[PDB]
Amino acid sequence: MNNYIFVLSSLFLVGCLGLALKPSPIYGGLGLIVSGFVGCLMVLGFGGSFLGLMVFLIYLGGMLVVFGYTTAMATEEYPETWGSNWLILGFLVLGVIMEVFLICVLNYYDEVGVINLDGLGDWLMYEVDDVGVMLEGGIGVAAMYSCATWMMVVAGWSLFAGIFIIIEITR
Amino acid sequence: MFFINILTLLVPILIAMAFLTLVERKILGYMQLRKGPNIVGPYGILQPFADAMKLFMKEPMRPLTTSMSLFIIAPTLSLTLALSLWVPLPMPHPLINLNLGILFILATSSLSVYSILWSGWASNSKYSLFGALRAVAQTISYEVTMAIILLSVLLMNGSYSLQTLITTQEHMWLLLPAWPMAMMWFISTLAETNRAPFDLTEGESELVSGFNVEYAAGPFALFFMAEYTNIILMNALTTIIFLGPLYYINLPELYSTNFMMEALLLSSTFLWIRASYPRFRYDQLMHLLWKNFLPLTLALCMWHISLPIFTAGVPPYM
Amino acid sequence: MWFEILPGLAIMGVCLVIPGVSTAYIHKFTNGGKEKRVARVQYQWYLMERDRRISGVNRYYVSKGLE
Amino acid sequence: RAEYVVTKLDDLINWARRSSLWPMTFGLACCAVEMMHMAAPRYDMDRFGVVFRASPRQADVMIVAGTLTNKMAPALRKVYDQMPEPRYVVSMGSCANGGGYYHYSYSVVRGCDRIVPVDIYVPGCPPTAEALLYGILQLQRKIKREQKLKIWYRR
Amino acid sequence: MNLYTVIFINILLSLTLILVAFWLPQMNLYSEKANPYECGFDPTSSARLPFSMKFFLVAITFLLFDLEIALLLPLPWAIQTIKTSTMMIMAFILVTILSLGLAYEWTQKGLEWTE
Amino acid sequence: TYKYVNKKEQESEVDMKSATDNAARILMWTELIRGLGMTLSYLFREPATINYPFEKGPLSPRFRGEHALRRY
Amino acid sequence: MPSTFFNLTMAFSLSLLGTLMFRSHLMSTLLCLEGMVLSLFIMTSVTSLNSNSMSSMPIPITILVFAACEAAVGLALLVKVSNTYGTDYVQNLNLLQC
Amino acid sequence: AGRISAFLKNAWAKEPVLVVSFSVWGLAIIMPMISPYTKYASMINKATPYNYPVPVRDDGNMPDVPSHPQDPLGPSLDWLKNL
Ligand SMILES: CCCCCCCCCCCCCCCCCC(=O)OC[C@H](COP(=O)(O)OCCN)OC(=O)CCCCCCCCCCCCCCCCC
Ligand SMILES: CCCCCCCCCCCCCCCCCC(=O)OC[C@H](COP(=O)(O)OCCN)OC(=O)CCCCCCCCCCCCCCCCC
Ligand code: SF4
Q: Is the CB of B237 under 6 A from ligand 2?
A: no
**DSSP structure class, residue D53:** B
Residue B123 and residue B301: Cα distance in Å, rounded?
41
CA distance A14 to A34: 10
B3–chain D nearest CA distance, Å: 31
**Closest Cα in chain E, distance from residue A112 (Å):** 33
Distance CA B145, CA B106 (A): 11
For chain D, how many structural domains are there in total?
Answer: 1
Interaxial angle between packed helices B3-31 and F30-43, expressed in degrees from 0 to 180 and rounded to the nearest 10: 90
Residues E59, G76 contacting (CB under 8 angstroms): no
Spacing, Cα F25 to ligand 2 middle (Å): 9
User: What b/e string do you get for A126-164 counting C-beta neighbours within 10 Å, with b at 16 or more?
Assistant: eeebeeebebbbbbbbbbbbbebbebbeebbebbbebbe
Neighbours of B145 (CB within 10 A): 24
Beta bridge partners of D62: D89
**CB count, 10 Å around CB of D19?**
22
> Kindly report the CA angle at D10 between D8 and D14, in degrees rounded to 5?
115
Beta-bridge partner residues of D69: D108
Cα(H14) to centroid of ligand 1, in Å? 47
H13 chain-F contacts, CB cut-off 8 A: 14, 18-19, 22-23
> Which atom of ligand 2 approaches the CA of B276 most closely?
40
Closest ligand, as measured to the CA of B181:
2
The dihedral through the CA atoms of D56, D59, D60, D62 has a sign that is: negative
Tell me if chain H has a CB within 8 Å of the CB of A133.
Answer: yes
E7 lines ligand 1 (CB under 6 A): yes
Letter for the amino acid at A124?
Answer: L
Helices B47-55 and B3-31 sit at what angle, rounded to 10 degrees?
A: 110
Give the integer Cα–Cα distance in Å for D139 and D48. Answer: 12
Instruction: Please report which ligand is nearest the Cα atom of B103.
Output: 1
DSSP codes, E23-67:
SSS-----STTTS--TTTS--SS-S-S----S-HHHHHHHHHHHH
Task: Point out which residues pair with D108 in neighbouring strands.
Answer: D69
| B177-to-B168, C67, D147 alpha-carbon distances in Å | 12, 51, 63
Structural domain harbouring D143: 1-155
Between chain A and chain F, are at least 3 CB pairs below 8 A?
no
CB A129 within 8 A of CB C42: yes
- Assign D121 to helix, strand or coil: strand
CATH code of the domain covering residue D76: 3.40.50.12280
Backbone angles phi, psi at B306, to 5 degrees: -90, 15
CA–CA gap between residue B21 and residue H30 (Å, rounded): 51
* β-sheet bridge partners, residue D61: D23, D88
Put simply, whether B317 touches E (Cβ < 8 Å) is yes
Q: What is the whole-number distance in angstroms between the Cα of residue B237 and the centre of ligand 1? A: 20
The residue segments making up the domain with residue E102 are: 2-115
* Residues A7, A121: Cα–Cα separation, whole Å: 11
The single-letter code of the amino acid at A11 is L
CA distances from B58 to B137, D7, D51 (A): 33, 20, 17
Q: Which residue's alpha carbon is at the smallest distance from atom 46 of ligand 1?
A: E8
- Specify burial of residue B18 (Cβ count, 10 A radius: 0-12, 13-18, 19+): buried
Rounded (5°) CA angle F4-F5-F8:
85
Neighbours of E22 (CB within 10 A): 15
Task: Output the CA–CA distances (angstroms, integers) from residue B253 to B167, C20, E32, G35, H76, in the order listed.
Answer: 16, 7, 56, 47, 42
Cβ proximity of A57 and G64 under 8 Å: no
Q: What is the DSSP letter of H68?
A: -
Residue E53, min C-alpha distance to chain G (Å): 10
* Facing residue for F36 by CB, picked from B27, B30, B276: B276
Q: Is H19 exposed, middle or buried (0-12, 13-18, 19+ CB in 10 A)?
A: middle
The answer to whether B39 touches D48, Cβ cutoff 8 Å, is yes
Q: Count the Cβ atoms, other than its own, within 10 Å of residue H60.
A: 4
Cβ atoms within 10 Å of D75's Cβ, excluding its own: 14
Q: How many CB atoms lie within 10 A of CB A13?
A: 25
Question: Between residues 171 and 230 of chain B, which touch chain C (CB distance below 8 Å)?
Answer: none
Contact H18, E102 (CB under 8 A): no
Q: Is B182 in the pocket of ligand 2 (CB under 6 A)?
A: yes
Specify the length of chain F in residues.
72
Q: How far is CA F46 from CA B32, B42, D47, in A?
A: 10, 18, 15
Which residues, at least 6 apart from B130, have a Cβ–Cβ distance to it below 8 Å?
Answer: B120, B207, B210
Q: How far apart are CA E30 and CA D82, in angstroms?
A: 11
G65 by Cβ neighbours in 10 Å (0-12 / 13-18 / 19+) ranks as: buried
Ligand located closest to D108 CA = 3
CA atoms within 13 A on the CB side of H30: 6
Q: What is the resolution of this structure in A?
A: 3.3
Beta partners for H49?
none
Contact at 8 Å (CB) between B221 and B56? yes
Which F-chain residues 2-31 have CB contacts (< 8 A) with chain H? 14, 16, 18-20, 22-23, 26-27
Q: Which of B39, B144, B45, B163 is nearest to B98 (CA)?
A: B163
Q: Which chains neighbour E (Cβ–Cβ under 8 Å, 3 or more pairs)?
A: A, B, D, G, H
CA–CA separation, B161 and B94 (whole Å): 11
Residues with CB under 6 A from ligand 3: D 29-31, 66-67, 93-95, 100-101, 125-126
Q: How many domains does chain E have?
A: 1
With vertex at residue E60, the alpha carbon angle to CA E58 and CA E61, rounded to the nearest 5 degrees, is: 65
Residues of E with CB under 8 A from a CB of A: 46, 48-53, 56-57, 59-71, 73-75, 77-78, 81-83, 86-87, 90-91, 93-94, 97-98, 100-102, 104-105, 108, 110
Q: CA E49 to CA A77: how far, in whole Å?
A: 6
Question: How many Cα atoms sit within 13 Å of A133 on the Cβ side?
Answer: 12
* Residues in contact with H26: Cβ distance below 8 Å, sequence separation at least 6, in sequence order: none
Q: Say how far apart CA E6 and CA E15 lie, in whole Å.
A: 14
Residue type, F18: S
Q: Which amino acid is at B277?
A: Y
Supply angle C-alpha A75, A77, A83, rounded to 5: 85
Closest CA to E34 of B224, D78, D73, B120: D78
CA–CA gap between residue D109 and residue D93 (Å, rounded): 13
Distance of alpha carbon H28 from the chain centroid: 14
Between the two ends of chain E, the Cα-to-Cα distance in Å is 53
* Polymer length of chain G: 98
Experimental method: cryo-EM
E104 SS3 class: helix
Q: Which of G3, G23, G48 sits opposite A22 (nearest CB)?
A: G23
Please, what's the b/e burial string for D28-59 (b: 16 or more CB within 10 A of its CB; e: otherwise)?
A: bbebbebbebbbbbbbbbbbbbbbbbbbbbbb
CATH number at residue E11: 1.20.58.1610
**So what's the architecture of G2-98 in CATH?**
Orthogonal Bundle (1.10)
Angle, alpha carbons H56-H58-H59 (nearest 5°): 115
CB contact under 8 A, G38 and A59: yes
Q: CA of E51: which chain G residue's CA is closest?
A: G86
